Write a protein that binds this ligand. Structure first.
Ligand SMILES: CN(C)c1nccc(-c2cnn3ncccc23)n1
Length: 343
């Protein structure tokens, strides 16, 4: 059985060969990442005399077209940040090779899920969480500039990569599921643990969905575990409610999917449909360990983890987890918050 004249496997992927030369330019070294889209290889660019990462898209029309959207968004973004100061991965060029679209990037290190694994799922320090938070908010401020207006739509630890294994600098990757404010098309978006209430409820959405995901990500980076680990959409909404209470009535009264999760009382108030902790009783104050030595008590007696530090982090996270997307904190104001260092 032969796929793509022998070049592909039965998964639509290119069969990588160590040392292969492409186009009198690139020498392929080895596989360094993989996912639903295809593969990422380390390769030497002999023209520019540098190592690069090549994202080799599957040879299949749905995967090709997803990547063509990504290329257009990257070309728009990189063009408005030629100094590469806004924390988005740099697309150098693209080409078609043996029926695969190939995207050439600067080469990065480990992703933030890999980093959590390296902590044995116990979390990184509050100081490193703060560095990651400040860079992510800067990236979201850039995506919100009007000529872009880009919603990433799939933020999670595995889509944030370190630049270098010994340093805190990061870049955001994977714009294949992204869209622009003026061209919103998708009803079903965001990976479940990081999915915003407005999406769960079938309501209109905007760039605020990415700020919701960021709040969830930052808690998990410090505790080691996902904040809201639902098995399905009903479980996901119930896990959100355990921490944050019943959503406001002004929201539920306008939500097409309200009755998937809630019921309206004669009061006019809303409650859950019929095992969970009562609404709002799983306090973020206790998940973080504000007054009890951090997650698991493991930060007791460590510098950089005072009660005061934890109260500032809690305040910022609760603003990122506002149920109302009109009042949820926006990137400009997140960057001004006293959790961040002045200079
Ligand atoms: C080391 N690696 C893995 C790497 N290095 C540079 C860039 C990328 C990269 C660019 N887009 N995507 N999308 C999805 C997953 C990875 C990437 N990966």
């Amino acid at each position: 059985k032969v796929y793509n004249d022998g070049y592909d496997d039965d998964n639509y992927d290119y069969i990588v060969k160590n040392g292969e030369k492409w186009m009198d330019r690139y020498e392929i070294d080895s596989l360094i990442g993989k996912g639903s889209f295809g593969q990422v290889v380390k390769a030497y660019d002999r023209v520019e005399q540098e190592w690069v990462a090549i994202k080799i898209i599957k040879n299949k029309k749905a995967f090709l077209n997803q990547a063509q959207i990504e290329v257009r968004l990257l070309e728009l973004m990189n063009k408005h940040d030629t100094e590469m100061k806004y924390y988005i991965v740099h697309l150098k060029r693209h080409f078609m090779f043996r029926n695969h679209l190939c995207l050439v990037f600067e080469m990065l290190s480990y992703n933030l899920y890999d980093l959590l694994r390296n902590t044995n799922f116990r979390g990184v320090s509050l100081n490193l969480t703060r560095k990651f938070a400040q860079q992510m908010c800067t990236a979201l401020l850039f995506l919100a500039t009007p000529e872009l207006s880009i919603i990433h739509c799939d933020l999670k630890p595995e889509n944030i990569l370190l630049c270098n294994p010994k340093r805190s600098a990061i870049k955001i990757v994977d714009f294949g599921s992204s869209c622009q404010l003026g061209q919103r098309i998708y009803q079903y978006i965001q990976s479940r643990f990081y999915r915003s209430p407005e999406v769960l409820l079938g309501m209109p959405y905007d760039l605020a969905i990415d700020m919701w995901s960021l709040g969830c990500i930052l808690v998990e980076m410090h505790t080691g575990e996902p904040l809201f680990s639902g098995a399905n959409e009903v479980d996901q909404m119930n896990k959100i409610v355990e921490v944050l209470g019943i959503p406001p009535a002004h929201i539920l009264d306008q939500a097409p999917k309200a009755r998937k999760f809630f019921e309206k009382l004669p009061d006019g108030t809303w409650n859950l449909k019929k095992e969970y902790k009562p609404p709002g009783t799983r306090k973020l104050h206790n998940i973080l360990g504000v007054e009890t030595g951090g997650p698991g008590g493991r930060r007791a007696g460590e510098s950089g983890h005072t009660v005061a530090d934890y109260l500032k982090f809690k305040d910022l996270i609760l603003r990122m987890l506002d149920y109302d997307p009109k009042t949820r904190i926006q990137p400009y104001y997140a960057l001004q918050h006293s959790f961040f260092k002045k200079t």
